[PDB]
Design a binder for this molecule. Structure first.
Ligand code: HEM
Ligand code: HEM
Ligand code: HEM
Ligand code: HEM
Ligand code: HEM
Ligand code: HEM
Ligand code: HEM
Ligand code: HEM
Ligand code: HEM
Ligand code: HEM
Ligand code: HEM
Ligand code: HEM
Ligand code: HEM
Ligand code: HEM
Ligand code: NA
Ligand code: NA
Ligand code: NA
Ligand code: NA
Ligand SMILES: [Zn+2]
Ligand SMILES: [Zn+2]
Ligand SMILES: [Zn+2]
Ligand SMILES: [Zn+2]
Length: 513
C-alpha cells in the first residue's frame, strides 16, 4: 500500500464526457468534468433557483434535461460545437472577469486529459433504513391515499389510461423495470434515479417548509465519506405491500401439457414474514420482479424462466436465490462454521432427514385432497390459511440430550507419546456450542433431534447417545487417527475464530520431558 501521503486526490465528482463516440472513433481523450466544482461555482453567480438552468434546459413539460446545453443528442457536428462554444465560452468570459476558471481555447489536453485523477465514487440505494426514512418523512406528502407515501415514487404503466400511475401494492424496486440502457420510453435506472430523486430533493429544499431533504450534489449521494454520515434507523418496521405472512410453494406445472408430470414430494409451507426480516431486500429472492417463483419456475421448466426447473430453483446448493443454497451460506457463520465446515454441508448431497423439514404434510386439508392436487386449485386464501397452520404445527428442538448422557470429560491418550493425553472439556464444549447456536431459527428447525448436534463431530455413524471411537474408522476412512483429531479439533477453533498469535500446542495437551 502506497504511503497515505502519496495516494492522490480522489473525487466522486467526475463526469467522463465521451458522448461523441456515439458518432464514431474519438480523435482525443474523453473530457473529465468535475461536476460539483462547477455547480458550487455557479450557485454563487446564479441568484435565483437558476443554478442548474445555466447548463441544463427543460423540456416542454418542465422536467430538467440531464444533458448539457441541449434536450437531445443530434449531430456529431452539432454536439462538438455545443461543447466548445459553451464550455470555452464561459471559461473565456470568466477569465476576462478575473475569475478562477476552466481551460481556454487552445488548452486541448487540459479538458482532453489522458491521465485524469482517481474516482472515489460509490453506488447508493435505499436500504431498509433509508427507505423507511422516506416512507416516514412528512415532507413527502401522501399521494392518492390518506397516509401512504408510496405514490410519490412508485408507479406502473396503466396500459389503457395511457398513463404511469401508482398502483397500490404493486410497487417494486426501480430495477425490476429500469435497466442499464433505456428500452423505449423507459429510462435507464441511471436517468430514472437522477430525475426523480434529485428533482424531489430540490423541491423540498426550495419549499417554504424548510424541511430536511436529500442530497443534490454528486458527492452528497456518491461520496463514501458522505454516506457514512446518513443517520440510520435500527428498527425499520416491516415493509407493508400486501404480502403473505405464510405461503404454499407448489409443484405448479407449466400451462403446457398435462409429459404427465405430477410431483414427487409433499408441498412446502414457507414462512414469508420471518424471511423478510432476515433479508436485506425483497429483490434478493425476487430477483427479476416481485411476483411468485412458479410463474417462471415449473415442474418441467419454461422459456420465461430460462427453463430453470423449480427443483433447481429451490435447491441449487450454489445459489443464494435457492432455499437450500442460501441456507448453505448462512451456515458459514462462525458460530455454525465449526460443525458445518467439518460436515461440508453445501458440498455433499443433502441428507434425506432434511427433506421432511420443508416437505411436510400440510395441516388443515384432507391428505387425499392434497395428492388430488387440492392446493393447486384452491383460493390464495385457503393456501395462506393452510400454510400458517402447517408452519404452526412444526416441531422445534431447544437444547440437546440431558447432561447425564453427555460425559463431562473424555481422555484421549490412545496416541500419547510426545504429549500427555488430552483432557477433552467434553460437556463444556457442547453447552457452549448450544449456547453459540442460541435461538437461531435455522438451527432450531433443521436440528430435528436433540441428539442431532452430536453428529457435528461424531459423523458417519448412526445417531446415538453412545457414538463409536474415532479410532473405529481411523488408522491403519482417509485421515489417520492423529490427523483426524488435529483436523477436527483445530479445524473448529479456527472456523469459530475464538483464539491467532495466542496459539500454543499446549492448549489441548501437555508436552512431556
Ligand atoms: C484547440 C484544442 C482542442 C481541440 C483540437 C479539440 C478537439 C476536439 C474534437 C476533435 C472533439 C470531438 C471528439 C473526439 O474526437 O475526441 C472534441 C470534443 C470535446 N471537446 Fe475539445 N478540443 C480542444 C479543446 C477543448 C477544451 C479546451 C475543452 C474544455 C473547455 C474541450 C471540450 C470538449 C468536450 C466537452 C468535447 C465533447 C466530449 C466527447 O469527446 O464526447 N475541448 N474536441
Ligand atoms: C445543482 C444544479 C444541477 C444539477 C442537479 C445537475 C445534475 C446533473 C445530473 C443528474 C447529471 C447526469 C449525471 C451522470 O449521469 O453522469 C448532470 C450532468 C452534467 N451536468 Fe449537471 N447539474 C446541475 C448543474 C450543472 C451546471 C451549472 C453545469 C455547467 C457548469 C452542469 C453541467 C453538466 C454536464 C456537462 C454534465 C454531463 C452531461 C453532458 O455531457 O451532457 N450541470 N448534471
Ligand atoms: C461541458 C463544458 C465544460 C467542460 C468540459 C469544463 C471543464 C472544466 C475543467 C476540466 C475544469 C478544471 C480546471 C482546473 O482544474 O483548474 C473546469 C473548471 C471551471 N469551470 Fe468548466 N467546463 C465546462 C463548462 C463550464 C461552464 C459552462 C462554466 C460557467 C458556468 C464553467 C465554469 C468553470 C469554473 C468557474 C471553473 C473553476 C471553478 C473551481 O475553481 O473549482 N465551466 N471546467
Ligand atoms: C409505503 C409505500 C411504499 C411501499 C409499500 C414501497 C415498497 C417498496 C418495495 C417492496 C420495494 C422493493 C424492495 C426490495 O426489493 O428490496 C421498494 C423499492 C424502492 N422504493 Fe419504495 N415503497 C413505498 C414508498 C416509497 C417512496 C415514497 C419512495 C421515494 C421517496 C420509494 C422509493 C423506493 C426506491 C428508490 C426503491 C429502490 C431501492 C433500491 O434498490 O435502491 N418508495 N419500495
Ligand atoms: C432513488 C432516488 C433517491 C435517493 C438515492 C435518495 C436518497 C436520500 C438520502 C441519502 C437521504 C438522506 C440524506 C441525509 O441524511 O443527509 C434522503 C433524504 C430525503 N429524501 Fe431522498 N432519495 C431519493 C429520492 C427521493 C424522492 C423521489 C423524494 C420525494 C418523494 C425524496 C425525499 C426525501 C426527503 C424529504 C428526505 C429528507 C427526510 C428526512 O430525513 O427528514 N427522496 N434521500
Ligand atoms: C451530478 C453528480 C452526479 C453524478 C456525476 C452521478 C453519476 C452517476 C452514474 C455515472 C451512475 C451510474 C453508474 C453505473 O451505471 O454503474 C449513477 C447512478 C445513480 N445515481 Fe448518481 N450521480 C450524481 C449525483 C447523484 C445524486 C445527488 C443522487 C441522489 C439523489 C444520485 C443517485 C444515483 C442513483 C440512485 C443511482 C443508481 C445506482 C445504481 O445504478 O444502482 N446521483 N450516478
Ligand atoms: C434432499 C431432500 C430433498 C429432496 C429429495 C427434495 C426434492 C424436491 C423435489 C423432487 C421437488 C419438486 C416438486 C415435487 O416433485 O414434489 C422439490 C420442490 C421444493 N423443495 Fe425440495 N427436496 C428436498 C429438501 C428440501 C428442503 C430442505 C427444502 C427447504 C429449504 C426444500 C424446499 C422445496 C421447495 C420450496 C420446493 C418447491 C415447492 C414444491 O413444488 O413443493 N426441499 N423438492
Ligand atoms: C419485503 C420484501 C418482499 C416483498 C414485498 C415480497 C412480496 C411477496 C408477494 C406479494 C408474494 C406473493 C406473490 C403472488 O402470489 O402474487 C411473495 C411470494 C414469495 N416470496 Fe416474497 N417478498 C419479499 C421478500 C422475500 C424474500 C427476502 C424472500 C426469500 C427469503 C421471499 C420469498 C418468497 C417466496 C418463496 C414466495 C412464494 C412464491 C411461490 O409460491 O411460488 N420474498 N412475496
Ligand atoms: C422468489 C421466487 C424465485 C426464486 C426463489 C427463484 C430462484 C431462481 C434460481 C435459484 C435460479 C438459478 C440459480 C441462479 O442463477 O442463481 C433462477 C434462475 C432464473 N429465474 Fe428465478 N426465481 C424466482 C422467481 C423468478 C421469476 C418470477 C422469474 C420471471 C419473471 C424468474 C426468472 C428466472 C430466469 C430467467 C432464470 C435464469 C437465469 C439464470 O440462469 O440465473 N425467476 N431463479
Ligand atoms: C422457498 C425456499 C425456502 C424455504 C422453504 C425456507 C425455509 C426455511 C425454514 C423452514 C426456516 C426456519 C424458520 C421458520 O420456518 O420460521 C428458514 C430460516 C431461514 N431462512 Fe429460509 N427458506 C427458503 C429460502 C431462503 C433463502 C433464499 C434465504 C436467503 C435469501 C433464506 C434465509 C433464511 C434465514 C436467514 C433463516 C433464519 C431465520 C432467522 O434466524 O430469523 N431462506 N428457512
Ligand atoms: C446457528 C448456526 C447454525 C445454523 C444456522 C445451522 C443450520 C443447519 C441447517 C440448515 C441444517 C440442515 C441442512 C442440511 O442438512 O443440509 C443443519 C444440520 C445439522 N447441523 Fe447445524 N446449524 C448451526 C450450527 C450447528 C452446530 C454448532 C452444530 C454442531 C454442534 C451443528 C450440527 C448439525 C448437524 C449434525 C446437522 C445434521 C447433518 C446431517 O443430516 O447429517 N449445527 N444445521
Ligand atoms: C501445532 C501444535 C501441536 C502439535 C505440535 C501437536 C502434536 C501432536 C502429536 C505429536 C500428537 C500425537 C500423540 C503424542 O505424541 O502425544 C498429538 C495428538 C493430539 N493432539 Fe495435538 N498438537 C498440536 C496442537 C493441538 C491442538 C491445538 C489440539 C486441540 C484443538 C490438539 C489435539 C490433539 C489430540 C486430541 C490428540 C490425540 C491425543 C492422544 O491420543 O494422545 N493438538 N498432537
Ligand atoms: C450431546 C451430543 C453428544 C453426545 C451424547 C456425545 C457422547 C459421547 C460419548 C458417549 C463418547 C465416548 C467417551 C469415551 O470413549 O469414554 C464421546 C466421545 C467424544 N466426543 Fe462426543 N458426544 C456428543 C457431542 C460431541 C460433539 C459436538 C463433539 C465435538 C465438539 C464431540 C466430540 C467427542 C470426542 C472428540 C470424543 C472422543 C472420542 C475418541 O477420542 O475416540 N462430541 N462422546
Ligand atoms: C478432540 C479435539 C478437541 C480438543 C482436544 C479440544 C480442546 C479444547 C480445550 C482444552 C478448550 C478450553 C480452552 C481453555 O479453557 O483455555 C476448548 C474450548 C472450546 N472448543 Fe475445543 N477441542 C476439540 C475440538 C473442538 C471442536 C471440533 C469444536 C467445534 C465443534 C470445538 C469448540 C470449542 C469451543 C467453542 C470452545 C470454547 C468453550 C468455552 O471456553 O466455553 N472444540 N477446546
Ligand atoms: Na455566463
Ligand atoms: Na480554437
Ligand atoms: Na403460493
Ligand atoms: Na497432524
Ligand atoms: Zn417474485
Ligand atoms: Zn381464511
Ligand atoms: Zn465438573
Ligand atoms: Zn484452539
Amino acid at each position: 500500500k502506497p504511503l497515505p501521503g502519496s495516494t492522490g486526490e480522489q473525487r466522486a465528482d467526475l463526469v467522463e464526457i465521451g458522448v461523441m463516440a456515439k458518432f464514431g472513433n474519438l480523435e482525443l481523450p474523453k473530457v473529465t468534468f468535475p461536476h460539483d466544482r462547477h455547480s458550487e461555482a455557479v450557485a454563487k453567480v446564479a441568484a435565483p433557483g437558476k443554478e442548474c438552468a445555466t447548463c441544463h434546459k427543460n423540456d416542454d413539460k418542465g422536467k430538467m434535461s440531464l444533458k448539457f446545453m441541449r434536450l437531445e443528442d443530434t449531430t456529431a457536428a452539432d454536439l462538438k460545437n455545443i461543447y466548445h462554444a459553451n464550455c470555452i465560452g464561459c471559461h473565456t468570459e470568466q477569465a476576462k472577469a478575473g475569475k478562477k476558471t476552466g481551460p481556454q481555447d487552445g488548452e486541448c489536453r487540459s479538458c482532453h486529459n489522458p491521465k485524469p485523477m482517481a474516482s472515489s465514487w460509490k453506488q447508493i440505494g435505499l436500504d431498509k433504513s433509508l427507505h423507511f426514512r422516506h416512507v416516514a418523512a412528512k415532507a413527502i406528502a401522501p399521494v392518492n391515499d390518506p397516509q401512504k407515501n408510496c405514490g410519490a415514487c412508485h408507479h406502473v404503466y396503466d396500459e389503457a389510461a395511457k398513463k404511469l400511475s401508482w398502483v397500490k401494492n404493486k410497487e417494486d424496486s426501480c430495477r425490476a423495470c429500469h435497466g442499464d440502457a433505456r428500452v423505449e420510453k423507459k429510462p435507464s435506472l441511471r436517468e430514472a434515479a437522477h430525475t426523480q430523486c434529485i428533482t424531489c430533493h430540490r423541491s423540498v429544499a426550495a419549499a417554504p417548509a424548510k424541511a430536511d431533504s436529500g442530497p443534490v450534489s454528486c458527492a452528497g449521494c456518491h461520496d463514501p465519506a458522505m454516506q457514512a454520515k446518513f443517520k440510520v434507523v435500527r428498527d425499520v418496521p416491516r415493509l407493508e405491500r400486501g404480502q403473505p405472512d405464510a405461503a404454499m410453494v407448489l409443484p405448479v406445472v407449466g400451462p403446457g401439457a398435462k409429459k404427465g408430470m405430477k410431483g414427487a414430494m409433499k408441498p412446502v409451507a414457507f414462512n414469508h414474514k420471518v424471511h423478510e426480516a432476515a433479508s436485506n431486500t425483497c429483490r434478493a429472492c425476487h430477483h427479476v420482479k416481485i411476483d411468485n417463483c412458479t410463474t417462471c419456475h415449473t415442474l418441467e421448466g419454461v422459456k420465461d424462466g430460462n427453463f430453470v426447473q423449480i427443483e433447481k430453483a429451490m435447491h441449487q446448493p450454489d445459489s443464494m436465490k435457492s432455499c437450500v443454497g442460501c441456507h448453505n451460506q448462512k451456515v458459514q457463520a462462525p458460530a455454525c462454521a465449526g460443525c458445518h465446515g467439518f460436515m461440508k454441508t453445501g458440498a455433499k448431497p443433502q441428507p434425506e432427514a432434511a427433506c421432511g423439514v420443508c416437505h411436510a404434510d400440510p395441516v388443515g386439508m384432507d391428505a387425499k385432497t392434497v395428492a388430488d392436487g387440492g392446493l393447486l386449485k384452491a383460493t390464495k386464501e385457503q393456501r395462506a390459511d393452510v400454510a400458517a397452520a402447517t408452519l404452526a404445527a412444526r416441531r422445534t428442538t431447544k437444547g440437546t440430550l440431558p447432561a447425564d448422557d453427555i460425559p463431562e470429560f473424555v481422555t484421549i491418550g490412545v496416541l500419547s507419546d510426545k504429549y500427555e493425553p488430552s483432557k477433552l472439556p467434553h460437556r463444556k464444549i457442547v453447552n457452549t456450542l448450544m449456547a453459540a447456536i442460541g435461538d437461531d431459527k435455522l438451527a432450531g428447525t433443521f436440528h430435528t433431534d436433540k441428539a442431532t448436534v452430536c453428529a457435528g463431530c461424531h459423523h458417519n455413524s448412526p445417531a446415538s447417545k453412545t457414538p463409536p471411537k474415532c479410532a473405529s474408522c481411523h488408522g491403519q476412512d482417509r485421515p489417520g487417527l492423529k490427523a483426524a483429531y488435529h483436523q477436527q479439533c483445530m479445524g473448529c477453533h479456527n472456523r469459530m475464530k475464538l483464539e491467532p498469535a495466542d496459539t500454543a500446542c499446549a492448549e489441548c495437551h501437555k508436552e512431556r520431558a
